Amino acid sequence: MRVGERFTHDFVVPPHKTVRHLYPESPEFAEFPEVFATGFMVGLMEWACVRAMAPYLEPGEGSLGTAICVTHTAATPPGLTVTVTAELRSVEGRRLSWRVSAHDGVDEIGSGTHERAVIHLEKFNAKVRQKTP
């Protein structure tokens, strides 16, 4: 995969991706404005990068997000379409860095960077099960 390549991905925001839906178990978020949650915008940014990566993984491999650095600069109600642009900045071993950017058809809603690590799934899964209570 080539540094500089861009992938864009569109998502109509449903009613259930507001801050109250991220944590339905939180009383403290229960009365928040009905806007797209930062944690859901982050997942939508990961989703874009994972889709861009998928052609380049060997069977048995996947990836996990290892860092996120983004701003969230305008609020998005349900119904608008959020487009995420993921651009490859670098590949160093199993580490990929992305520039990630999102716009709701009205405003830029956020941007910054995201890093992912390529993992061997069977091995990672067996390791992480050994910390399971």
Added chain:
Amino acid sequence: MRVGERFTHDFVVPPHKTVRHLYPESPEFAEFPEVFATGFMVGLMEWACVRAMAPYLEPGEGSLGTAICVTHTAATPPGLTVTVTAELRSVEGRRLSWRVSAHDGVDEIGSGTHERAVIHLEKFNAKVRQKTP
């Protein structure tokens, strides 16, 4: 509200806070490992800060996350307790900046900064309506 003020928030990770649960609409996340998603980790760090700032907000005020910049350095299967620490690093009028970190009892899982803005809830909510389809 006081700079260097610290809040701890403990949360037992349930099975439904994996990558697959953040976006059940996504075929691409369907076979990810069953570990605590970044977007849910972001959410939990935001929840810690909203709890800490609550006793300082005036009636009719709330807040929104305006930036998240964190690493995610180890994985967490359901069942472990994630403890988030939120330490206020600056307040300048409406803008609060927190140093956030989380550990799952076994590993430090993540570290960085979270910014939030105090909003006038009626006035903000009116602004969301003028862009609601």
